[PDB]
């Protein structure tokens, strides 16, 4: 599934949610693999480089969509700033044209993902212990501390429940401002855009709510599980299954944190557009 994001005015990007999770899962496998032994630590330079070459390659496949994406930006530019029928239909076709462009470059995206799976599985396959019945967990401990711990704290320092309460509040206010607002001639083009922006904002809200639930669920699971795989040893097979389980937990957690932030920014970019149209209704036309 695809998520379209408008973080700043004039900027528009998309994410293939399964691809982001897949690419990230293999990043964790690669790192857990090299951190297990002190002799393989120095391979961080080579792993950082390969992952960077894959992200830049994936970005080069989306950068070859930039024409149709900029065409959608211009349609959004007209919609967001009227100061709606054909404009509403214009928006949906340009949106379906972009979605069609992403499906056409599927083979190009899939291969990079497949190239990352091959690299990740290969590093992981090469994971060896001095004594297979007593595998160290220093790698799991180092990886968590250096790639994951700061993200759990970042989430805990923020208040995402308040963020959803503050988002519903803005949605409640626009619903009230639309209803408890005296009707006026020529305001129709603006009333339709507000009702439209509000719907897109309610859709963005539902996504943020869906992702915050995953962040909250995964933050407890990660913190609980990490305690059980940290200051001990495992038989090789158990160590590997334990690394696989953590990578899946990390990948899902990271993905939706990344998406919540991006959708938070898009809810507020579209909120700036509601403030502007309501300002035009009250000041340029005074609709008490």
């Amino acid at each position, epitope marked *: 599934s695809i998520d379209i994001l408008q973080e700043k005015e004039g900027h528009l990007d998309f994410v293939i949610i399964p691809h982001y999770t897949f690419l990230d899962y293999y990043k964790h496998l690669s790192y857990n693999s090299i951190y297990h032994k002190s002799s393989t630590y120095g391979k961080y330079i080579a*792993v950082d480089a*390969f992952i960077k070459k894959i992200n830049e*390659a994936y970005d080069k496949v989306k950068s070859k969509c930039n024409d149709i994406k900029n065409d959608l930006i211009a349609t959004i530019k007209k919609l967001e700033h009227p100061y709606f029928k054909k404009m509403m239909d214009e928006y949906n076709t340009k949106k379906k044209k972009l979605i069609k462009c992403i499906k056409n470059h599927e083979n190009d995206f899939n291969k990079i993902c497949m*190239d990352m799976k*091959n690299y990740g599985t290969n590093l992981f396959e*090469q994971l060896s212990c001095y004594n297979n019945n007593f595998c160290n967990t220093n790698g799991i401990r180092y990886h968590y501390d250096e790639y994951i711990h700061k993200l759990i704290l970042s989430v805990k320092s923020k208040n995402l429940n308040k963020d959803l309460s503050d988002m519903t509040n803005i949605l409640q206010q626009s619903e009230l401002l639309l209803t408890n607002l005296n009707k006026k001639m020529g305001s129709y083009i603006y009333i339709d855009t507000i009702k439209f922006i509000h719907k897109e904002m309610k859709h963005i809200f539902n996504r943020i709510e869906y992702h915050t639930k995953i962040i909250n669920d995964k933050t407890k699971i990660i913190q609980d599980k990490i305690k059980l795989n940290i200051w001990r040893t495992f038989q090789k097979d158990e160590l590997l299954k334990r690394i696989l389980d953590m990578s899946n937990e990390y990948s899902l957690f990271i993905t939706s944190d990344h998406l919540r932030q991006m959708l938070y920014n898009t809810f507020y970019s579209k909120e700036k557009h509601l403030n502007n149209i309501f300002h035009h209704l009250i000041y340029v036309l005074q609709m008490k």
Partner: antibody
Amino acid sequence: VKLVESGGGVVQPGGSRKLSCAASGFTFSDYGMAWVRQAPGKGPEWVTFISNMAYSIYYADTVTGRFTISRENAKNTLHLEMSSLRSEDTAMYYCTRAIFDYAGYWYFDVWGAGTTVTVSS
Amino acid sequence: DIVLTQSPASLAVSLGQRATISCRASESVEYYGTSLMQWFQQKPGQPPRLLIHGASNVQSGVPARFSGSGSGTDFSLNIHPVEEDDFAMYFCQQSTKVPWTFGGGTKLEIKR
């Protein structure tokens, strides 16, 4: 670091053969392994590859469905089960150790002396 | 399938001279800024011996007189200066796409 192939000899057409390869001087389970063959008067031809823990297995289209690579990590042994042998399979069969370079590629660094398989009636 | 075409098929050289042998691939053997071209040496009745792996990476134990260059589809092996033990067969090989392919070979022979 040594690789020793065994199991060669004469096979009649349509016949089968198993080839073994004993590895010494390194941790066998830490490497990908392969069979490469060389027909008399011809260059090397890659036939099959098995990764460290057998997650990845590849075959040449010329061998696909007829040959089976396998490994016994604890016994330092690479195996090659050959099945519907034609005259075209007559070759020196080499066993090779594969290194996974951190730039994301496999290369063969250590090869054994080989074992001859002669497919003739 | 990737077809590696080696040129020349045979090359005669004298002791102390440079020997440059080339390989051309049917399509790019590049994989994320790395050209996956290997070079092997082979003497009669002996298995192939690895010389270069990353198009340019000299294997440990292989002397400094051997060097590799090129990218994409055009690759070359340089031996300078040529020594007595250098007269052998040389093959190139790609590991970018399976089946992993070798070239036909170039025989480096002594001039007399």
